[PDB]
Amino acid sequence: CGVPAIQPVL
Amino acid sequence: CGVPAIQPVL
Amino acid sequence: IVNGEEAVPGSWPWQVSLQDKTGFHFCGGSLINENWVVTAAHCGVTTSDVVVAGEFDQGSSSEKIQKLKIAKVFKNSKYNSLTINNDITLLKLSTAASFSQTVSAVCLPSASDDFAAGTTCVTTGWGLTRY
Amino acid sequence: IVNGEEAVPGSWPWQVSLQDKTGFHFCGGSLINENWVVTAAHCGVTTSDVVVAGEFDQGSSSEKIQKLKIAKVFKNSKYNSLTINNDITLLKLSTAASFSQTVSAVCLPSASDDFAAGTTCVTTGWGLTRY
Amino acid sequence: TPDRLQQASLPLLSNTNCKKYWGTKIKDAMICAGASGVSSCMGDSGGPLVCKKNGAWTLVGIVSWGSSTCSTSTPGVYARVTALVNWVQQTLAAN
Amino acid sequence: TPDRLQQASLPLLSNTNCKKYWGTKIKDAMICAGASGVSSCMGDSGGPLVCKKNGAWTLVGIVSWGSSTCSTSTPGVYARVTALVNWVQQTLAAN
Ligand SMILES: CCCCCC
Ligand SMILES: CCCCCC
Ligand SMILES: CCCCCC
Ligand SMILES: CCCCCC
Ligand SMILES: CCCCCC
Ligand SMILES: CCCCCC
Ligand SMILES: CCCCCC
Ligand SMILES: CCCCCC
Ligand SMILES: CCCCCC
Ligand SMILES: CCCCCC
């Protein structure tokens, strides 16, 4: 859990 | 409907 | 009701108390007939919750209350959670209310029904008496 | 989110949209695993409502979204409607989510877990961008 | 929260007059009452607002929302049953 | 309501510091975040507040309530997942 395949960008 | 057996007192 | 008065026992027949399985009263309601209860959509009623009719004193164990099980929750699909508009939900009871001297139905108005400003009505329930 | 930014498509996998049968998004949610969704108790989720996973653009019909049916609503019985405390409800899905590059689970903390003040985190969703 | 059932008389306001307090938050399926010295409060929600018509008590509103402080000078907001009775009649017929 | 998914970074506050804004409305199973220039708003409810712990995104809060105007100077209130994870673990086990 907690680790997306597409990564967030803030 | 709308006519209670016990009557309200305000 | 902040600044309200104590109702006469049995005088508001259709008034029911919605409580979760913890015994806690979160919302009120109204019997429109022996198998249907109207409440607010924002109340969030599930089927783990129970309808309690024939009640006046919540702390009185001698009362002949009617604990009614909810079969289905019919939320109005025009209900808007963001504006809190169209806030009405129907509750189909899995077990029908027995109408008595204390348990009965309130009348529903016609769509055409008219209720002018300045007209005095009545609100009931077990909500905070102070804040 | 008032003053937020547009998220990257697929980057917040667990984010789901709760919508009634009218298509209207009223609340958000989070996949904790393939059969369970966490949302707020105050959201008032019924089983007429649907869970939508794998979505980014609500107005895009080409997206491979997953419309999930709710089997049961598990409201936290310590939820207080009056204070809005213990505002968490679980949704058991009647149909399990297929985990993909865009659909997945967020991690749950330990009761013992510690999150200090001054720590920067992230909030997501399709709520009003202005009021 | 009181142990026994309370009650309170209060007048119906006009939406126009109520928009003076709540502005654009007041929508068509809402009806105000209060500002009279009484106020519905947390826990009353879902509850009934009844008026007598032809000597029979009839559902005019559902306790919805209002002042966070349950202010007795500020009008409470109830769901307009008149606008919501068609859906109710449709639901009971079909179920 | 936006068509596509939005996001916003924001800090966690202390309940003590948050009671300065909300007083006694802040309870133990609530955690505040905001007053940073961003704000969660109507429609975001139920949604997630995530923080990274050991490089994994972990549920710290649920979008609950806040300012009626979604004021970006006023902290939002989320349900404290840390206080509510025991009940969740109990529920999933039994169902
Ligand atoms: C498969 C474990 C990682 C999931 C990322 C949300
Ligand atoms: C039997 C019709 C009258 C009901 C009073 C609530
Ligand atoms: C409903 C009764 C309230 C009395 C205290 C203001
Ligand atoms: C008529 C009810 C009296 C108690 C509350 C003022
Ligand atoms: C719904 C009406 C019931 C009357 C019973 C005689
Ligand atoms: C979430 C984006 C908000 C932009 C307008 C303030
Ligand atoms: C990184 C998202 C840009 C659009 C909203 C400011
Ligand atoms: C819940 C864990 C699923 C992993 C599938 C291989
Ligand atoms: C005329 C008496 C009204 C009492 C409640 C304010
Ligand atoms: C440091 C930038 C913050 C933007 C939102 C107020």
Coordinates of C-alpha atoms and ligand atoms in Angstrom, one line a residue:
Chain A
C1 CA 0.0 0.0 0.0
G2 CA 0.8 3.7 -0.1
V3 CA 3.1 3.6 -3.2
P4 CA 1.3 4.7 -6.5
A5 CA 2.3 3.4 -9.9
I6 CA 1.9 6.9 -11.3
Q7 CA 3.9 9.2 -9.0
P8 CA 2.5 12.5 -7.5
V9 CA 4.0 15.9 -8.3
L10 CA 3.3 18.7 -5.9
Chain B
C1 CA -54.0 11.2 10.0
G2 CA -53.1 14.4 11.9
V3 CA -55.5 14.0 14.8
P4 CA -53.8 12.5 18.0
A5 CA -55.7 10.5 20.6
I6 CA -53.9 12.4 23.4
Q7 CA -54.3 16.1 22.6
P8 CA -51.4 18.6 22.5
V9 CA -51.3 21.6 24.9
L10 CA -49.1 24.5 24.0
Chain C
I1 CA -35.4 22.8 21.1
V2 CA -33.7 25.7 22.8
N3 CA -36.4 27.5 24.9
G4 CA -39.1 24.9 24.2
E5 CA -41.6 23.2 26.5
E6 CA -42.0 19.7 27.7
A7 CA -44.6 18.0 25.5
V8 CA -47.6 16.1 26.8
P9 CA -47.0 12.3 26.8
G10 CA -48.5 10.7 23.7
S11 CA -49.6 14.0 22.2
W12 CA -47.2 13.9 19.2
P13 CA -47.9 10.3 18.1
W14 CA -45.9 10.4 14.8
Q15 CA -42.7 11.6 16.5
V16 CA -40.1 8.8 16.5
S17 CA -36.5 8.7 17.7
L18 CA -33.7 7.4 15.4
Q19 CA -31.0 5.7 17.4
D20 CA -27.9 3.7 16.5
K21 CA -27.2 0.3 18.1
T22 CA -25.4 2.1 20.9
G23 CA -28.8 3.5 22.1
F24 CA -27.9 7.0 21.1
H25 CA -30.6 9.3 19.6
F26 CA -29.1 11.2 16.7
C27 CA -32.1 12.3 14.8
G28 CA -35.9 12.5 15.0
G29 CA -38.5 11.4 12.4
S30 CA -42.2 11.1 11.6
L31 CA -44.5 8.2 10.9
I32 CA -46.4 8.9 7.7
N33 CA -48.1 5.4 8.0
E34 CA -47.4 2.1 9.7
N35 CA -44.5 1.0 7.5
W36 CA -42.8 4.3 6.5
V37 CA -40.9 6.9 8.4
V38 CA -39.7 10.3 7.1
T39 CA -36.5 11.9 8.3
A40 CA -33.7 14.0 6.9
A41 CA -31.3 12.8 4.3
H42 CA -28.4 14.5 6.2
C43 CA -29.2 12.3 9.2
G44 CA -27.4 9.4 7.4
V45 CA -29.7 6.6 8.4
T46 CA -28.4 3.0 7.8
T47 CA -30.2 -0.3 8.5
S48 CA -28.0 -1.0 11.7
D49 CA -30.1 1.9 13.1
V50 CA -33.5 1.5 14.8
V51 CA -36.8 3.5 14.8
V52 CA -38.3 4.0 18.2
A53 CA -42.0 4.9 18.4
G54 CA -44.3 5.5 21.4
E55 CA -41.7 7.3 23.4
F56 CA -41.7 10.4 25.6
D57 CA -39.1 9.9 28.3
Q58 CA -35.8 8.4 26.9
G59 CA -34.6 7.6 30.4
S60 CA -37.8 5.7 31.3
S61 CA -37.6 1.9 31.1
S62 CA -41.3 1.3 32.0
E63 CA -42.5 2.8 28.7
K64 CA -44.2 0.6 26.1
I65 CA -41.9 1.8 23.3
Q66 CA -41.8 0.2 19.8
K67 CA -38.3 -0.6 18.5
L68 CA -38.7 -0.8 14.7
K69 CA -36.1 -2.3 12.3
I70 CA -35.3 -0.5 9.1
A71 CA -35.5 -2.6 5.9
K72 CA -34.5 0.0 3.4
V73 CA -33.2 3.6 3.2
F74 CA -34.7 5.7 0.3
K75 CA -32.6 8.8 0.1
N76 CA -34.1 11.5 -2.3
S77 CA -31.7 11.4 -5.3
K78 CA -32.3 15.2 -5.7
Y79 CA -30.6 15.6 -2.3
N80 CA -27.7 17.9 -2.4
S81 CA -25.0 17.2 0.3
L82 CA -23.2 20.4 -0.6
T83 CA -26.2 22.7 -0.3
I84 CA -28.2 20.4 2.0
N85 CA -31.1 20.9 -0.4
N86 CA -33.9 18.3 -0.9
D87 CA -33.1 16.9 2.6
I88 CA -35.7 14.1 2.9
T89 CA -35.3 10.4 3.3
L90 CA -37.8 7.7 3.6
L91 CA -37.3 4.7 5.7
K92 CA -39.1 1.4 4.8
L93 CA -39.7 -0.5 8.1
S94 CA -39.0 -4.2 7.9
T95 CA -41.4 -4.5 10.8
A96 CA -44.7 -2.4 10.7
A97 CA -45.7 -0.1 13.5
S98 CA -48.8 -0.9 15.5
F99 CA -50.9 2.2 15.6
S100 CA -52.3 3.0 19.1
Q101 CA -53.3 5.9 21.3
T102 CA -49.6 7.0 21.2
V103 CA -48.4 5.8 17.9
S104 CA -49.9 7.3 14.7
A105 CA -49.4 9.2 11.4
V106 CA -49.1 12.9 10.7
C107 CA -50.8 14.2 7.5
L108 CA -48.9 15.1 4.3
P109 CA -49.7 18.3 2.4
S110 CA -50.6 18.5 -1.3
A111 CA -48.0 19.9 -3.7
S112 CA -50.5 22.7 -4.1
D113 CA -50.7 23.2 -0.3
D114 CA -50.2 26.7 0.9
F115 CA -48.7 27.8 4.2
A116 CA -48.3 31.6 4.6
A117 CA -45.7 33.6 6.5
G118 CA -46.8 34.7 9.9
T119 CA -48.6 31.4 10.4
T120 CA -47.8 29.7 13.7
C121 CA -46.9 26.0 13.7
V122 CA -45.1 23.5 16.0
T123 CA -41.7 21.7 16.1
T124 CA -40.9 18.7 18.4
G125 CA -37.9 16.4 19.3
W126 CA -35.2 15.5 21.8
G127 CA -32.5 17.9 20.5
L128 CA -30.2 20.1 22.6
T129 CA -32.2 22.5 24.9
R130 CA -29.1 24.7 25.3
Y131 CA -26.0 24.8 23.2
Chain D
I1 CA -9.9 22.3 -2.5
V2 CA -10.0 26.1 -2.6
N3 CA -6.6 27.2 -3.9
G4 CA -5.4 23.7 -4.8
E5 CA -3.7 22.3 -7.9
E6 CA -4.8 19.8 -10.6
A7 CA -3.5 16.3 -9.7
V8 CA -1.5 14.2 -12.0
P9 CA -3.8 11.5 -13.6
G10 CA -3.5 8.2 -11.8
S11 CA -1.2 9.6 -9.1
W12 CA -3.7 9.3 -6.2
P13 CA -4.9 5.6 -6.8
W14 CA -7.0 5.1 -3.7
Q15 CA -9.1 8.2 -4.3
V16 CA -12.6 7.3 -5.3
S17 CA -15.7 9.4 -5.9
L18 CA -19.0 8.6 -4.2
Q19 CA -22.0 9.4 -6.4
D20 CA -25.7 8.8 -6.1
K21 CA -27.8 7.2 -9.0
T22 CA -28.2 10.7 -10.5
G23 CA -24.4 10.8 -11.4
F24 CA -23.8 13.5 -8.8
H25 CA -20.5 13.4 -6.7
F26 CA -21.3 14.2 -3.1
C27 CA -18.3 12.8 -1.3
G28 CA -14.9 11.4 -1.8
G29 CA -13.4 8.2 -0.3
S30 CA -10.3 5.9 -0.1
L31 CA -9.7 2.3 -1.1
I32 CA -8.0 0.6 1.9
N33 CA -8.0 -2.7 -0.1
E34 CA -10.0 -4.2 -3.0
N35 CA -13.3 -4.7 -1.2
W36 CA -13.4 -1.9 1.3
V37 CA -13.7 1.9 1.0
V38 CA -13.4 4.4 3.9
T39 CA -15.4 7.6 3.8
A40 CA -17.0 10.0 6.3
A41 CA -20.0 8.9 8.4
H42 CA -21.6 12.3 7.8
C43 CA -21.6 11.6 4.0
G44 CA -24.7 9.4 4.5
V45 CA -23.8 6.6 2.1
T46 CA -26.6 4.2 1.2
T47 CA -26.5 1.1 -1.1
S48 CA -28.3 3.0 -3.9
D49 CA -25.0 5.0 -4.2
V50 CA -22.0 3.8 -6.2
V51 CA -18.2 4.0 -5.7
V52 CA -16.2 5.2 -8.7
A53 CA -12.5 4.3 -8.9
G54 CA -9.9 5.0 -11.5
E55 CA -11.1 8.5 -12.2
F56 CA -9.5 11.8 -12.8
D57 CA -11.7 13.8 -15.1
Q58 CA -15.4 13.5 -14.1
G59 CA -16.5 15.0 -17.5
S60 CA -14.4 12.5 -19.6
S61 CA -16.3 9.6 -21.1
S62 CA -13.3 7.8 -22.5
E63 CA -11.9 7.0 -19.1
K64 CA -11.7 3.4 -17.9
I65 CA -13.4 4.0 -14.6
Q66 CA -14.7 1.3 -12.2
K67 CA -18.3 1.7 -11.0
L68 CA -18.4 -0.3 -7.8
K69 CA -21.7 -1.4 -6.0
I70 CA -21.9 -1.0 -2.2
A71 CA -23.0 -4.2 -0.4
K72 CA -23.1 -2.8 3.1
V73 CA -22.6 0.5 5.0
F74 CA -20.7 0.1 8.3
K75 CA -21.2 3.4 10.2
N76 CA -18.9 3.7 13.3
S77 CA -21.3 3.4 16.2
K78 CA -19.2 5.9 18.2
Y79 CA -20.1 8.4 15.5
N80 CA -21.7 11.5 17.0
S81 CA -24.1 13.3 14.6
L82 CA -24.3 16.3 17.0
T83 CA -20.6 16.9 17.5
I84 CA -19.6 15.2 14.2
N85 CA -17.0 13.2 16.1
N86 CA -15.8 9.7 15.1
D87 CA -16.8 10.6 11.5
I88 CA -15.7 7.4 9.7
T89 CA -17.7 4.8 7.8
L90 CA -16.6 1.7 6.0
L91 CA -18.2 0.6 2.8
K92 CA -18.1 -3.2 1.9
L93 CA -18.2 -3.5 -1.8
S94 CA -20.5 -6.1 -3.3
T95 CA -18.1 -6.1 -6.3
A96 CA -14.3 -6.0 -5.7
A97 CA -12.0 -3.4 -7.2
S98 CA -9.5 -4.6 -9.7
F99 CA -6.2 -3.1 -8.7
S100 CA -4.2 -1.5 -11.5
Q101 CA -1.7 1.3 -12.3
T102 CA -4.5 3.7 -11.3
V103 CA -6.5 1.8 -8.8
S104 CA -4.8 0.9 -5.5
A105 CA -4.8 1.1 -1.7
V106 CA -3.5 3.8 0.7
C107 CA -1.8 2.7 4.0
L108 CA -3.4 2.8 7.4
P109 CA -1.5 4.0 10.4
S110 CA -1.0 2.1 13.7
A111 CA -3.0 3.3 16.7
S112 CA 0.4 4.1 18.1
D113 CA 1.3 6.1 14.9
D114 CA 2.6 9.6 15.4
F115 CA 2.1 12.7 13.2
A116 CA 3.6 15.9 14.6
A117 CA 2.3 19.5 14.1
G118 CA 4.2 21.4 11.4
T119 CA 4.4 18.2 9.3
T120 CA 3.3 18.8 5.6
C121 CA 0.8 16.3 4.1
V122 CA -1.7 16.2 1.2
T123 CA -5.4 16.4 0.6
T124 CA -7.3 15.5 -2.6
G125 CA -10.8 15.4 -4.1
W126 CA -13.4 17.1 -6.4
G127 CA -14.9 19.5 -3.9
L128 CA -15.6 23.2 -4.5
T129 CA -12.5 25.2 -5.7
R130 CA -14.2 28.4 -4.7
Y131 CA -17.2 29.0 -2.5
Chain E
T1 CA -30.1 16.4 25.0
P2 CA -33.4 16.3 27.1
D3 CA -34.8 13.0 28.4
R4 CA -38.4 13.8 27.4
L5 CA -40.0 15.2 24.3
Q6 CA -40.0 19.0 24.0
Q7 CA -42.3 21.2 21.8
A8 CA -42.2 24.8 20.5
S9 CA -44.6 27.1 18.7
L10 CA -43.0 29.3 16.0
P11 CA -44.0 31.2 12.8
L12 CA -43.2 30.5 9.2
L13 CA -41.2 33.2 7.4
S14 CA -40.9 34.0 3.7
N15 CA -37.9 32.7 1.8
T16 CA -37.3 36.4 0.7
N17 CA -37.3 37.5 4.3
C18 CA -35.2 34.4 5.2
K19 CA -32.6 35.2 2.5
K20 CA -31.9 38.3 4.5
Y21 CA -30.4 36.1 7.2
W22 CA -29.1 33.2 5.0
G23 CA -28.8 34.7 1.6
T24 CA -28.3 32.3 -1.3
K25 CA -28.0 29.3 1.0
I26 CA -31.8 29.3 1.1
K27 CA -33.1 27.2 -1.9
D28 CA -36.5 26.4 -3.2
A29 CA -37.0 23.2 -1.2
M30 CA -36.3 24.9 2.1
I31 CA -38.7 26.8 4.4
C32 CA -37.7 28.9 7.4
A33 CA -39.3 29.3 10.8
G34 CA -38.0 30.8 14.0
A35 CA -36.3 34.1 15.0
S36 CA -39.3 34.1 17.5
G37 CA -37.4 33.3 20.7
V38 CA -37.2 29.5 20.2
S39 CA -34.9 27.4 18.0
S40 CA -34.5 23.8 16.8
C41 CA -31.1 22.4 17.6
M42 CA -28.7 19.5 17.1
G43 CA -30.5 16.3 17.6
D44 CA -33.8 17.7 16.4
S45 CA -32.8 17.1 12.8
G46 CA -35.1 14.8 10.8
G47 CA -37.9 16.0 13.0
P48 CA -41.3 17.4 12.1
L49 CA -42.6 21.0 11.7
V50 CA -46.4 20.7 11.8
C51 CA -49.1 23.2 11.1
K52 CA -52.9 22.6 11.4
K53 CA -54.9 22.6 8.2
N54 CA -58.6 21.7 8.4
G55 CA -58.0 20.8 12.0
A56 CA -55.5 18.0 11.1
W57 CA -51.8 18.3 11.9
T58 CA -49.9 18.3 8.5
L59 CA -46.2 18.0 7.7
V60 CA -44.9 21.3 6.5
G61 CA -41.2 20.9 7.2
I62 CA -38.3 18.6 8.3
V63 CA -35.7 19.9 10.8
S64 CA -32.6 20.4 8.6
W65 CA -30.2 23.2 9.7
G66 CA -29.6 26.6 11.1
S67 CA -27.4 28.6 13.5
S68 CA -24.3 26.7 14.8
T69 CA -25.2 28.2 18.2
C70 CA -29.0 27.4 17.9
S71 CA -29.6 31.2 18.1
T72 CA -33.2 32.0 19.0
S73 CA -33.1 35.2 17.0
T74 CA -31.9 33.4 13.9
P75 CA -34.4 31.4 11.8
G76 CA -34.1 27.7 11.5
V77 CA -34.1 25.9 8.2
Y78 CA -36.4 23.0 7.4
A79 CA -37.0 20.9 4.3
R80 CA -40.1 22.1 2.4
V81 CA -42.4 19.1 2.5
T82 CA -44.8 20.8 0.0
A83 CA -42.0 20.6 -2.6
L84 CA -41.0 17.1 -1.6
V85 CA -44.4 15.3 -1.4
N86 CA -44.5 14.4 -5.1
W87 CA -41.3 12.2 -4.7
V88 CA -42.7 10.7 -1.5
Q89 CA -45.9 9.7 -3.3
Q90 CA -43.9 8.2 -6.2
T91 CA -41.7 6.2 -3.8
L92 CA -44.5 4.7 -1.7
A93 CA -46.4 3.7 -4.8
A94 CA -43.4 1.9 -6.4
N95 CA -42.2 0.2 -3.1
Chain F
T1 CA -17.1 21.5 -8.3
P2 CA -14.0 20.8 -10.6
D3 CA -14.1 18.2 -13.3
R4 CA -10.7 16.8 -12.5
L5 CA -9.0 15.7 -9.3
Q6 CA -7.3 18.5 -7.3
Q7 CA -4.5 18.3 -4.6
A8 CA -3.1 20.5 -1.9
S9 CA -0.2 20.4 0.5
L10 CA -0.9 21.7 4.0
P11 CA 0.4 21.3 7.6
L12 CA -1.0 19.4 10.6
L13 CA -1.8 21.6 13.6
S14 CA -2.0 20.7 17.2
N15 CA -5.5 20.2 18.7
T16 CA -4.5 22.8 21.4
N17 CA -3.6 25.3 18.7
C18 CA -6.7 24.3 16.7
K19 CA -9.0 24.9 19.8
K20 CA -7.9 28.5 19.4
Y21 CA -10.0 28.6 16.3
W22 CA -12.7 26.0 17.1
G23 CA -12.6 25.8 20.8
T24 CA -14.6 22.9 22.4
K25 CA -15.9 21.7 19.0
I26 CA -12.5 20.0 18.5
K27 CA -12.7 16.5 20.1
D28 CA -10.1 13.8 20.5
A29 CA -10.9 11.9 17.3
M30 CA -10.4 15.0 15.1
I31 CA -7.1 16.4 13.6
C32 CA -6.7 19.9 12.0
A33 CA -4.8 21.0 9.0
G34 CA -4.8 24.1 7.0
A35 CA -4.8 27.9 7.8
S36 CA -1.9 27.6 5.2
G37 CA -3.5 29.3 2.2
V38 CA -5.5 26.2 1.0
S39 CA -8.7 24.7 2.3
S40 CA -10.8 21.6 1.8
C41 CA -14.4 22.4 0.9
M42 CA -17.9 21.0 0.3
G43 CA -17.6 17.9 -1.8
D44 CA -14.2 17.0 -0.5
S45 CA -15.8 15.3 2.6
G46 CA -15.0 11.7 3.1
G47 CA -11.8 12.3 1.3
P48 CA -8.2 11.5 2.3
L49 CA -5.5 13.4 4.2
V50 CA -2.3 11.6 3.6
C51 CA 1.3 12.0 5.0
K52 CA 4.3 9.9 4.0
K53 CA 5.7 7.6 6.7
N54 CA 8.6 5.3 5.6
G55 CA 8.1 6.5 2.1
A56 CA 4.5 5.1 1.9
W57 CA 1.4 7.3 1.8
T58 CA -0.6 6.6 4.9
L59 CA -4.1 7.7 5.9
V60 CA -3.9 10.4 8.6
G61 CA -7.3 12.0 8.2
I62 CA -10.8 12.1 6.6
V63 CA -12.2 15.4 5.2
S64 CA -14.9 16.2 7.8
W65 CA -15.7 19.8 8.4
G66 CA -14.6 23.4 8.7
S67 CA -15.3 27.0 7.7
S68 CA -18.8 27.5 6.0
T69 CA -16.9 29.8 3.5
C70 CA -13.9 27.3 3.1
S71 CA -11.7 30.1 4.5
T72 CA -8.0 29.4 3.6
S73 CA -6.9 31.1 6.8
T74 CA -9.1 28.9 9.0
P75 CA -8.0 25.3 9.6
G76 CA -10.1 22.4 8.3
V77 CA -11.2 19.5 10.4
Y78 CA -10.5 15.9 9.5
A79 CA -11.3 12.6 11.4
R80 CA -8.2 11.3 13.2
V81 CA -7.5 8.0 11.5
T82 CA -5.0 7.1 14.2
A83 CA -7.9 7.1 16.8
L84 CA -10.2 5.2 14.4
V85 CA -7.9 2.4 13.0
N86 CA -8.7 0.0 15.9
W87 CA -12.5 0.0 15.0
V88 CA -11.6 -0.5 11.3
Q89 CA -9.4 -3.5 12.1
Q90 CA -12.1 -5.0 14.2
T91 CA -14.7 -4.4 11.5
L92 CA -12.7 -5.9 8.6
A93 CA -11.8 -9.0 10.7
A94 CA -15.4 -9.7 11.6
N95 CA -16.8 -9.0 8.1
Ligands
LIG1 C1 1.0 -3.1 -4.3 C2 1.4 -2.3 -3.1 C3 1.5 -0.8 -3.4 C4 0.2 -0.1 -3.7 C5 0.3 1.4 -4.0 C6 -0.9 2.2 -3.7
LIG2 C1 -56.7 7.4 12.5 C2 -56.6 8.7 11.9 C3 -56.1 9.8 12.9 C4 -54.6 9.6 13.3 C5 -54.1 10.6 14.3 C6 -52.6 10.8 14.2
LIG3 C1 -36.8 22.6 25.1 C2 -36.6 23.3 26.4 C3 -35.5 24.3 26.5 C4 -35.4 24.9 27.8 C5 -34.1 25.6 28.0 C6 -33.9 26.8 27.1
LIG4 C1 -45.7 23.0 29.1 C2 -44.3 22.4 29.4 C3 -43.6 23.1 30.7 C4 -42.1 22.8 30.9 C5 -41.2 23.5 30.0 C6 -41.3 25.1 30.2
LIG5 C1 -53.8 3.2 6.3 C2 -55.2 3.2 6.8 C3 -55.4 2.0 7.8 C4 -56.8 2.0 8.4 C5 -57.0 0.7 9.2 C6 -58.5 0.4 9.4
LIG6 C1 -8.4 23.3 -6.3 C2 -8.1 24.5 -7.2 C3 -8.6 25.8 -6.7 C4 -8.2 26.9 -7.6 C5 -9.1 28.1 -7.3 C6 -8.9 28.8 -6.0
LIG7 C1 0.2 21.4 -10.8 C2 -1.3 21.7 -11.1 C3 -1.5 23.1 -11.9 C4 -2.9 23.6 -12.1 C5 -3.5 24.2 -10.8 C6 -2.7 25.4 -10.3
LIG8 C1 -4.2 -7.7 -0.2 C2 -2.9 -8.2 -0.9 C3 -3.2 -8.7 -2.3 C4 -1.9 -9.1 -3.0 C5 -2.2 -9.9 -4.3 C6 -1.0 -10.6 -4.8
LIG9 C1 -45.2 34.7 23.4 C2 -44.2 33.8 24.1 C3 -43.0 33.3 23.3 C4 -42.0 32.5 24.1 C5 -40.8 32.0 23.4 C6 -40.0 33.1 22.9
LIG10 C1 4.3 28.1 -0.4 C2 3.1 28.2 -1.3 C3 1.8 27.9 -0.7 C4 0.6 28.1 -1.7 C5 -0.8 28.0 -1.1 C6 -1.1 29.1 -0.1

